């Protein structure tokens, strides 16, 4: 049966003026301004949120340690950990294909 | 001026023809 | 508190005290949601307890989805009936 | 009198295009050394919808031949182009859907779209959804190629102009009726302020040459001469015939 | 606003050359279901955070008080 007011000068229900009702140690209801929630980082080509990376605001990523923003595997904090393994098959097979196509070209001018 | 003092336009009042 | 105590016994609930529709007082979707969540939960715990097999569970999951099982007591009578005729066929074949 | 409605559209105050949600200018890759002596490979990265357009756009990424970077161009997606497909642009490209070739090397009867008028303008002809041109003849001398335009005109352009093989996706869009003014309100909400349109016969004489009178009628002939004056051109300008034709449709 | 569970690490914080004020708080609590007991809380004020150590045994409560250095100002209750 207790009502509460805004704690700042903004009187409108914008996206940056969310309110959570919090019971204080004084025994009364009081509003608390909450921040906009962070979004998990996404992979560069598959669109899924890669795991092992903390979900924070971009400028508070410079305060957390190194281990919260990367994975020990190469292309750690950029790819989907199946995106890495997909471009290894492609990098190994094409270069193996590019050298067996070079010896097929050699077959032409050496026997015509 | 206001809604009163009507003399001009009229349905069947003054200022006809 | 005295008026709410009499409503638990069934008083003050006749046709002269209803001003909204039957769907307005209690939606039909909530009754249907309550019906499936009892039938699906009972049917899932019978598969885990060994009282029913996965082939009979699959044909009862879809049967309970449409109709013919209006409460839990109707489903357990069909399960026993579907298990009683299953053992007489095996004993004769 | 008063300045009539179509004269006010040239000032460009409230009649300008709404270009907030547009993805950019859909232009072909600029003509460089690689596209007139060989070909270059590009990847279809993402196909997206363009606001105010009926045909979707395609994000195609090429490699810069002179510096280590990536260049993303804005193409008009043809029907059949999918993501992850290799796009070959240049003089020595093959005849596949989505490839960009000079139209002086394609055979007669090729279905191409996004055709340059002059070599270097990065696509001028056949850009709407479901539209295409057909190469009808080749002149090896003077490097001139004859094509047919979607309106049926038979133009001749240079053989060095480029064009994307295939037909533009999103065809058959105008086949569905809108069924209401609400769907027509949203269609023109992202193009320009030109809807709804008030008839000129139902307005005042100051607002239109057709206005006025005790009955809703034009009064004079609705066919306006070509050498008229801005303010008089309201109706059928330089019409050579009128009425509905009870006969065959557009000629060959 | 930080809790310390090690008593050997607690003694190192009292000789950090910057802590000047320490407080001991006696709390009247009770056990699982029976008699009340005496809970103590040793709080050391640092330069960026307040470290505290809670001992639920009265036998070790008195022993830790004499182990504190005398240059540290202890505030009883």
């Amino acid at each position: 049966a207790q009502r509460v007011t805004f704690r700042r000068r903004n009187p409108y229900n914008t996206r940056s003026n969310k309110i959570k009702v919090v019971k204080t140690p004084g025994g009364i209801l009081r509003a608390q301004h909450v921040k906009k929630l962070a979004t998990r980082p996404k992979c560069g080509d598959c669109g899924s949120a890669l795991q092992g990376i903390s979900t924070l605001r971009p400028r508070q990523y410079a305060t957390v340690s190194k281990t919260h923003k990367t994975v020990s595997r190469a292309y750690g904090g950029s790819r989907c950990a199946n995106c890495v393994k997909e471009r290894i098959i492609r990098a190994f097979l094409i270069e193996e294909q590019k050298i067996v196509k070079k010896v097929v070209k050699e077959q032409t001018e050496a026997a015509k | 001026r206001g809604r009163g003092r009507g003399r001009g336009r009229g349905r069947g009042r003054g200022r006809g023809r | 508190r005295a008026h709410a105590q009499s409503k638990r016994e069934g008083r003050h609930s006749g046709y002269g005290k209803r001003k909204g529709t039957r769907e307005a007082r209690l939606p039909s979707q909530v009754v249907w949601i309550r019906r499936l969540r009892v039938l699906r939960r009972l049917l899932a715990k019978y598969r885990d307890a060994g009282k029913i097999d996965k082939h009979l569970y699959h044909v009862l999951y879809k049967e309970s989805k449409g109709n013919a099982f209006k409460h839990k007591r109707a489903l357990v009578e069909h399960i026993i009936q579907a298990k009683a005729d299953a053992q007489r066929e095996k004993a004769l074949n | 009198g008063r300045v009539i409605r179509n004269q006010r559209k040239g000032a460009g105050s409230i009649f300008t295009s709404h270009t907030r949600l547009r993805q950019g200018a859909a232009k072909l890759r600029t003509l460089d050394y690689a596209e007139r002596h060989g070909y270059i490979r590009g990847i279809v990265k993402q196909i997206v919808h363009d606001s105010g357009r009926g045909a979707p756009l395609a994000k195609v990424v090429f490699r810069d031949p002179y510096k280590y970077r990536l260049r993303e161009e804005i193409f008009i997606a043809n029907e059949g182009v999918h993501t992850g497909q290799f796009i070959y642009a240049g003089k020595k490209a093959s005849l596949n859907v989505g490839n960009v070739l000079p139209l002086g090397s394609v055979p007669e009867g090729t279905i191409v779209s996004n055709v340059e008028e002059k070599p270097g303008d990065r696509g001028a002809l056949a850009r709407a959804s479901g539209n295409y041109v057909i190469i009808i003849g080749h002149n090896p001398d003077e490097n001139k190629t004859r094509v047919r335009l979607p309106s049926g005109a038979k133009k001749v352009i240079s053989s060095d102009a480029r064009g994307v093989i295939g037909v533009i996706a999103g065809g058959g869009r105008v086949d569905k009726p809108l069924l209401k003014a609400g769907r027509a309100f949203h269609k023109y909400r992202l193009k320009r302020n030109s809807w709804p349109k008030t008839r000129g016969v139902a307005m005042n004489p100051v607002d239109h040459p057709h206005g006025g009178g005790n009955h809703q009628h034009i009064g004079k002939a609705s066919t306006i001469s070509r050498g008229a004056v801005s303010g008089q051109k309201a109706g059928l300008i330089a019409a050579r015939r009128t009425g509905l034709l009870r006969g065959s449709q557009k000629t060959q | 606003a930080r809790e310390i569970t090690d008593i050997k690490q607690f003694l190192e914080l009292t000789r950090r050359a910057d802590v000047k004020t320490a407080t001991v708080k006696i709390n009247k609590k009770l056990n699982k279901a029976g008699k009340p007991f005496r809970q103590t809380k040793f709080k050391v004020r640092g330069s960026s955070s307040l470290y505290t150590l809670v001992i639920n045994d009265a036998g070790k409560a008195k022993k830790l008080i004499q182990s504190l250095p005398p240059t540290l100002k202890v505030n009883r209750l």
């Binding site: - | - | - | 919808h49 043809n78 005849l95 | -």
Partner: protein, 91 residues
Amino acid sequence: AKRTKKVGITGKYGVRYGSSLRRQVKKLEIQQHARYDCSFCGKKTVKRGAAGIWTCSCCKKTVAGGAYTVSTAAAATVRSTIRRLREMVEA
């Protein structure tokens, strides 16, 4: 139970817009909401969104096609008249 006799998906429009205009939309609204087989993964997971764009539910392949159909009949002849003309270049 079949709820409606002939209106089908156009029963949301009520008694408005006329019967003939509601029948042409019914022919195109069924096609634009139907599911289609993916040529790459073989699954019937292609759905329409942002007309002219046909995305596979899984398989992440996005194919540009017609406004209400994946492959229009006017574009199928285009896909065959270029394949026929391509074979004459090398042969």
